[PDB]
């Protein structure tokens, strides 16, 4: 009736991003950062 090839996709990007986010909960979306420090009286 109809005449496919496996390519009619791309819709899943929502899921894909989600999955990635979760993996970047297991860690961090590119690397893990580093903190900041402070000073006295000038404070």
């Amino acid at each position: 009736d109809i005449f496919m090839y496996p390519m009619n996709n791309e819709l899943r990007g929502l899921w894909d991003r989600i999955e990635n986010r979760i993996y970047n909960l297991r860690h961090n979306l590119t690397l893990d950062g580093k903190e900041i420090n402070m000073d006295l009286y000038d404070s």
Partner: protein, 49 residues
């Protein structure tokens, strides 16, 4: 302050300090007295009057 060690630490330090450098060139205390005073300071050149 408690957000961070050094932040908190500095807070502690100040709250320890009886005084070393609190040097109230400015201060929490205020009244328009303070701006009036400043106006006195900043007008012209300083004088006893």
């Amino acid at each position: 302050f408690a957000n961070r060690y050094g932040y908190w630490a500095a807070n502690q330090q100040l709250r320890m300090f009886p005084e070393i450098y609190v040097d109230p060139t400015l201060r929490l205390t205020k009244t328009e007295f303070f701006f009036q005073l400043e106006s006195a300071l900043n007008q012209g050149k300083l004088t006893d009057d």
